[PDB]
Design a protein around this ligand. Structure first.
Ligand SMILES: OC[C@H]1O[C@H](O[C@@H]2[C@@H](O)[C@@H](O)O[C@H](CO)[C@H]2O)[C@H](O)[C@@H](O)[C@@H]1O
Ligand SMILES: OC[C@H]1O[C@H](O[C@@H]2[C@@H](O)[C@@H](O)O[C@H](CO)[C@H]2O)[C@H](O)[C@@H](O)[C@@H]1O
Ligand SMILES: OC[C@H]1O[C@H](O[C@@H]2[C@@H](O)[C@H](O)O[C@H](CO)[C@H]2O)[C@H](O)[C@@H](O)[C@@H]1O
Ligand SMILES: [Ca+2]
Length: 559
C-alpha cells in the first residue's frame, strides 16, 4: 500500500488470477522488448481471433485504461466483454509509442520518432481509455478479447479499473465563467479578469482545443473542470509537438487548476517547450486532480515555492513528470501517480538562494519509467521523500541521490537531512552510459542499483534512507559511488530498516571503478537492520577494494 492512493485499481494482465488462451511473456529487463518494457516485465500477447485475457474486478468500475502494445503506425480496436457479453471496443494506437535509438545511443531515448536503418524501437507501450455506460460490480469478469475486425495482434500489459462519479457541474455560474461551444477558454478568462465578482472559469465536460499557451494574469484564478474523465483539454491532434497549456504569470500566483485532463500532441521529447503548465517563480499555486499525457513535462519549477500538486495523474510524457529546480522550496507534491514518464518521474534539482529546501514529496507512485529514475534528488537541504512506490525502470535507479552539478551553479547537499522514508522499489535499476575499462564488468554499460548514492563534484552529506523494501532489483539494492578526481567525502549517510530481496548480483555495491579513470567511494555509510536476501552473487561487493570508504554495521545486518 505504499505510494499514491488513487481511485483506480491496477491489475496485471499476466496475473495468475486471469484466465487466458493467449501467450504470457516470460519476464526480462530489456528495453526495446515487449516483456522488458511491460509493467511487471510481462504482458499477455493476443495473436489470434478469439484470444483473450479475463480480468476479475475487485472494486466496482465503469471506466478502464488498457496499457497495450500494437504494431508501429497502426490504429484499431480490441474488444471488451462483461460476464461474457460484448460491451465495446478500445481505440488502440501506436501514435504516441515507438521511439528509436540504438543500444549505444540510449542518450537519444525519447527524442527520435522516426524509424530508420539500423534503429531499434523502444517505448513500445501506450494506453487506451474507455468508459462504459454501466457500473459493473466487484467480481465482474472483464474480458479483453481480440475479435474479428480488431487489430492483428496486441500485447495486453495491465488494466486500470475505476468507478468514475458523474461529471461535476459549474460550482456557481455567477462566479465561474463557463467555457462553451462558442466561448473559448481565452474568452472566458478575459471575462473573468474584467469582472472582479468572478472567481475563475469552469470548463464543462467535453473536448476543448488548446492550441496555445493560455496565460493567467490579473489575479489569482480558479480553473475548474468536471473531472478528468470528462473535461479534456486537447492539443490539435493533427499537429505534433505543439507547446500548449497554461502559463501562470506572477499576478496569478495563488491560482488553482483542478478536475480536468490535458491531452498533448507531443510524439517525442523537445528540450525547452513542452511543459503543460509553465510558472517560473510561481507561488501558492494548486494543481489538483488533473490527468496529463503526451507533454514533455507536467511542470518544471524554477524558484517556485509554496505550491501544491495533489491527486494528479502524469502518464506517457517525454521527459520529467514534475521537476522543481533552482530554489524551489516548501512545495507539497502529494498523492500523485506517474506511469511512463520520459525522464525522472518526480525530481528535485537544487541550485542557486542557496538550496531547494523544505519540500515534501509524499505518497507518490512512479512506474514504467521509460528513462532515468522514478525519484531523483540532486542536492538540496531539508527535503522529504516519504511513502514512495517505484517500479519497472528501463535504464536507471528507482531513486537517484546525486551531488553532481551537471555544469550548473549548485552547492550540492546542505546541512539538513534529505530523507527517503518508506519506499517500495520493484524491479528498478538498469543500464546506461558506458563502462570502458570498468571493474565488475558485465556488459557495455554502467549498471545501476535500485538506489544510487552518487557523490559528484559537490557536497554529498546528510542523507537518510529508511524503511525501504527493494524487490528483485535488476542488479543491486544500494549502489554507492564517488566521482574521481573530486572524491567528495560522503558524510552522515545512513540506511535503516531496509530489505533487499533477490538482487541478481549484489545486495550492496561499492563502485570500485565505474569506467577508465574512475576510482572507489570516499567517506562511509551506516547500516541498521539492513537485510540482503538471496543475492545472485554475494551480499556486498567492493568493501575490501574501497579503502577510503567505511561501512558501519550498526546492528541487525545479515552481511
Ligand atoms: O535548469 C536547466 C534547464 O532546465 C530546462 O530545460 C531542460 C533541459 O535542460 C533538459 O534537461 O530537458 C528538460 C526537459 O525537456 C528541459 O526542461 C529549462 O527549459 C532551461 O531553460 C534550463 O536551463
Ligand atoms: O562528464 C560529462 C557528463 O557527465 C555526466 O554523465 C556522466 C557520464 O559521462 C559517465 O561518465 O558516467 C557518469 C556516472 O558514472 C555520468 O554522471 C552527465 O550526465 C552528462 O550529461 C555529461 O555529458
Ligand atoms: O485522433 C485523436 C485521438 O483519437 C484517439 O483517442 C481518443 C480521444 O481523441 C478521445 O478524446 O477519447 C477517446 C476515448 O477515450 C480516445 O479513444 C486515439 O487513441 C489518439 O491516439 C488520437 O490522438
Ligand atoms: Ca504486465
Amino acid at each position: 500500500g505504499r505510494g499514491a492512493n488513487m481511485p483506480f485499481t491496477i491489475m496485471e494482465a499476466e496475473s495468475t488470477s486471469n484466465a487466458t488462451n493467449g501467450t504470457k511473456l516470460t519476464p526480462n529487463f530489456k528495453p526495446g522488448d515487449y516483456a522488458g518494457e511491460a509493467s511487471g516485465r510481462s504482458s499477455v500477447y493476443l495473436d489470434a481471433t478469439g484470444e483473450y485475457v479475463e480480468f476479475t474486478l475487485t472494486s466496482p468500475a465503469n471506466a478502464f485504461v488498457l496499457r497495450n502494445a500494437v504494431a508501429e503506425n497502426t490504429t484499431g480496436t480490441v474488444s471488451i466483454y462483461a460476464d461474457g457479453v460484448s460491451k465495446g471496443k478500445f481505440n488502440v494506437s501506436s501514435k504516441f509509442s515507438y521511439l528509436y535509438a540504438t543500444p549505444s545511443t540510449l542518450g537519444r531515448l525519447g527524442y527520435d520518432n522516426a524509424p530508420g536503418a539500423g534503429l531499434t524501437a523502444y517505448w513500445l507501450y501506450e494506453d487506451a481509455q474507455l468508459m462504459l455506460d454501466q457500473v459493473y460490480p466487484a467480481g465482474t469478469k472483464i474480458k479483453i478479447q481480440k475479435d474479428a475486425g480488431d487489430v492483428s495482434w496486441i500485447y495486453v500489459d495491465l488494466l486500470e479499473t475505476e468507478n468514475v462519479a458523474p461529471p461535476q457541474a459549474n460550482p456557481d455560474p455567477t462566479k465561474y465563467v463557463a467555457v462553451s461551444a462558442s466561448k473559448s477558454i481565452d474568452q472566458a478568462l478575459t471575462e473573468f479578469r474584467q469582472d472582479n465578482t468572478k472567481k475563475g472559469i469552469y470548463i464543462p465536460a467535453g473536448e476543448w482545443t488548446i492550441n496555445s499557451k493560455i496565460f493567467l494574469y490579473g489575479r489569482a484564478t480558479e480553473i475548474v473542470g468536471a473531472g478528468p474523465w470528462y473535461t479534456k483539454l486537447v492539443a490539435p491532434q493533427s499537429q505534433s509537438n505543439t507547446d500548449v497549456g497554461f502559463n501562470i504569470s506572477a499576478a496569478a500566483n495563488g491560482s488553482t487548476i483542478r478536475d480536468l485532463s490535458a491531452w498533448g500532441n507531443y510524439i517525442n521529447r523537445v528540450d525547452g517547450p513542452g511543459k503543460f503548465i509553465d510558472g517560473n517563480g510561481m507561488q501558492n499555486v494548486t494543481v489538483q486532480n488533473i490527468w496529463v499525457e503526451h507533454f514533455v513535462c507536467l511542470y518544471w519549477g524554477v524558484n517556485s515555492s509554496y505550491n501544491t500538486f495533489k491527486n494528479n495523474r502524469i502518464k506517457n510524457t517525454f521527459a520529467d513528470g514534475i521537476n522543481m529546480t533552482n530554489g524551489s522550496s516548501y512545495n507539497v507534491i502529494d498523492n500523485n501517480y506517474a506511469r511512463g514518464t520520459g525522464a525522472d518521474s518526480f525530481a528535485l534539482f537544487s541550485a542557486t538562494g542557496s538550496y531547494n529546501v523544505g519540500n515534501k514529496y509524499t505518497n507518490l507512485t512512479a512506474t514504467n519509467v521509460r528513462r532515468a529514475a522514478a525519484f531523483a534528488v540532486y542536492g538540496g537541504s531539508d527535503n522529504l521523500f516519504q511513502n514512495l512506490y517505484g517500479a519497472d525502470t528501463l535504464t536507471y535507479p528507482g531513486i537517484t541521490i546525486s551531488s553532481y552539478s551537471f555544469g550548473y551553479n549548485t552547492l550540492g547537499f546542505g546541512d539538513q537531512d534529505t530523507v527517503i522514508d518508506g519506499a517500495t522499489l520493484d524491479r528498478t535499476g538498469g543500464d546506461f552510459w558506458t563502462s570502458v575499462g570498468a571493474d565488475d564488468k558485465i556488459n557495455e554499460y554502467q549498471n545501476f542499483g535500485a538506489i544510487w548514492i552518487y557523490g559528484g563534484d559537490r557536497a554529498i552529506k546528510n542523507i537518510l534512507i529508511k524503511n525501504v523494501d527493494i524487490n528483485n532489483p535488476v542488479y543491486f539494492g544500494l549502489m554507492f559511488q564517488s566521482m574521481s578526481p573530486n572524491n567528495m567525502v560522503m558524510q552522515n549517510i545512513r540506511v535503516e530498516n531496509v530489505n533487499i530481496n533477490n538482487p541478481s548480483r549484489y545486495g550492496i555495491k561499492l563502485v570500485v571503478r565505474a569506467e577508465q579513470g574512475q576510482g572507489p567511494a570516499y567517506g562511509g555509510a551506516s547500516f541498521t537492520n539492513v537485510k540482503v536476501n538471496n543475492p545472485g552473487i554475494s551480499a556486498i561487493y567492493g568493501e575490501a577494494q574501497s579503502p577510503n570508504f567505511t561501512v558501519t554495521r550498526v546492528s541487525g545486518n545479515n552481511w
